[PDB]
């Protein structure tokens, strides 16, 4: 419960008031308690869910080859409230020692009838997802052994309470759309969801803690050959820009339609360099493996962006201020360390070194010009929003829904016959639509045919 308050933890303060009269107190507990607000009225999706460690730990618990010894399983089911009898059973692998596959321990939380299947973010081979995609349509209940045990790490398949294939990431939990916590609140009231949420949290934490999840300094390192690969890219991209400047001087411009000649030059240049930065980023997403403790956080969605992991071992790129490139300076140049009248790549604000290798004095100053932009804006955008909200609240607060389903203003002037183009409340509708025939058919037909 720290997306809805939009709180962090670096000193933010909260207040708490206690209602007194018996009618008021009762009213507060039935109508405003937390569990009645897992789905947000703004969009059809869950708002209270797993955050940073909750997602990342969930990945480590469900990867191909996460065999937990008997002592640990026993120790962690007592850490997650759940209370089972003498059925840890039955020890999938006893070759090395009698031990447990990671999928079965997670399976002890979902109820015994959830059949769901959806592709998720970690897939990288659209063919191996599709080799398994037909065996669900034309059979609907196969044996688990054949090709479900020929599983992939990115196609969540749960059938009647058993996670056969797939791995859990930010498509199950999380603040943006997760189609697992979502389905469990529609199908099985509200009270069930809080226990499933609560038990997932304390489970997932216990694996992440005892398994070790550090980040060191070598996680950003590339070898000598890959470094040289980036260097040749920065040289060619610079020389491409120089050739265009020489074309501008000799009057063979070939200018763009709309903009004036001076702006056509700038427009061509920015496109040339943006490709080169992204091209270096493709190299970074290629060489350093997906099995270190830093990229893992990036691809699942727990304080991540592949754009900043690449921005730590490759070019930073250009540096802009509200659109145009850096023009504000001395009469003819930006800084006094370049020659007057240089529109080159390096002169007009293009940093070549990364945060690891280190920024030089010219480049470091350029980076400050781009960083003050973000600072100024964020405090200004709030100002206009707050006033604007006061307008629409003092205009719409009067409307109610009458018992015959009609929205009426306080003077009996009917604003809308059958509310909101009738009749499903946005807190309970499916991504703009209503009842969802495609889900209901598969759900009831599976529970009856499966037996």
């Amino acid at each position: 419960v720290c997306p809805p308050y939009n709180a962090d933890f670096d000193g933010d303060e909260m207040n708490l008031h206690v209602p007194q009269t018996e009618e008021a107190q009762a009213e507060a507990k039935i109508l405003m308690e937390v569990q009645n607000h897992i789905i947000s009225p703004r969009y059809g999706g869950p708002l209270i869910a797993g955050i940073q460690d909750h997602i990342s730990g969930g990945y480590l618990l469900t990867r191909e080859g996460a065999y937990f010894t008997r002592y640990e399983v026993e120790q962690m089911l007592m850490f997650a409230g759940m209370d089972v009898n003498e059925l840890p059973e039955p020890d999938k692998y006893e070759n090395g020692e009698p031990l447990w596959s990671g999928k079965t321990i997670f399976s002890l939380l979902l109820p015994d009838d959830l059949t769901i299947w959806y592709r998720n973010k970690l897939c990288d081979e659209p063919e191996r997802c599709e080799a398994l995609e037909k065996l669900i349509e034309e059979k609907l209940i196969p044996d688990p052994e054949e090709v479900r045990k020929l599983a992939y790490d990115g196609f969540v398949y749960i059938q009647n309470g058993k996670l056969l294939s797939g791995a859990v990431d930010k498509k199950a939990y999380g603040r943006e759309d997760g189609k697992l916590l979502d389905i469990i609140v529609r199908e099985y009231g509200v009270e069930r969801a809080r226990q499933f949420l609560d038990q997932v949290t304390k489970l997932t934490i216990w694996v992440i803690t005892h398994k070790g999840f550090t980040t060191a300094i070598d996680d950003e390192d590339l070898p000598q050959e890959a470094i040289d690969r980036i260097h040749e890219i920065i040289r060619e991209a610079e020389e491409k820009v120089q050739r265009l400047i020489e074309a501008y001087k000799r009057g063979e411009l070939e200018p763009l339609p709309g903009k004036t000649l001076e702006e056509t030059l700038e427009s061509k240049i920015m496109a040339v360099l943006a490709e080169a930065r992204d091209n270096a980023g493709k190299v970074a997403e290629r060489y350093l493996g997906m099995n270190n403790h830093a990229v893992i956080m990036a691809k699942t969605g727990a304080r991540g962006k592949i754009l900043n992991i690449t921005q730590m071992a490759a070019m930073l790129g250009q540096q802009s201020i509200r659109g145009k490139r850096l023009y504000r300076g001395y009469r003819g140049r930006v800084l006094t360390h370049f020659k007057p009248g240089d529109l080159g790549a390096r002169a007009r604000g293009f940093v070549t070194n990364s945060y690891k290798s280190g920024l030089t004095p010219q480049e470091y100053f350029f980076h400050a010009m781009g960083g003050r932009e973000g600072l100024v804006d964020t405090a200004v955008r709030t100002a206009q929003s707050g006033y604007m909200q006061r307008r629409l609240i003092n205009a719409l607060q009067d409307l109610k829904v009458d018992y015959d389903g009609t929205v009426r203003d306080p003077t009996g002037i009917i604003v809308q016959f059958k509310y909101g183009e009738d009749g499903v409340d946005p807190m309970k509708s499916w991504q703009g639509k209503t009842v969802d025939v495609d889900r209901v058919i598969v759900r009831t037909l599976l529970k009856m045919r499966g037996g």
Binding site: D53, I205, I208, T209, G212, F213, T214, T215, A216
Partner: protein, 49 residues
Amino acid sequence: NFRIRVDTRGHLMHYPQVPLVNSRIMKAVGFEDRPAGQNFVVAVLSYHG
């Protein structure tokens, strides 16, 4: 001169320490002669959450 002084609110951290790696400028300004902070020994890992 903290012990002979009158001021609305003052602070005194008992055991300050000179920062391991610092800048050459900090010694030429006089921050090393009256510092403000301590050297912890940090480990990076996610504990119990």
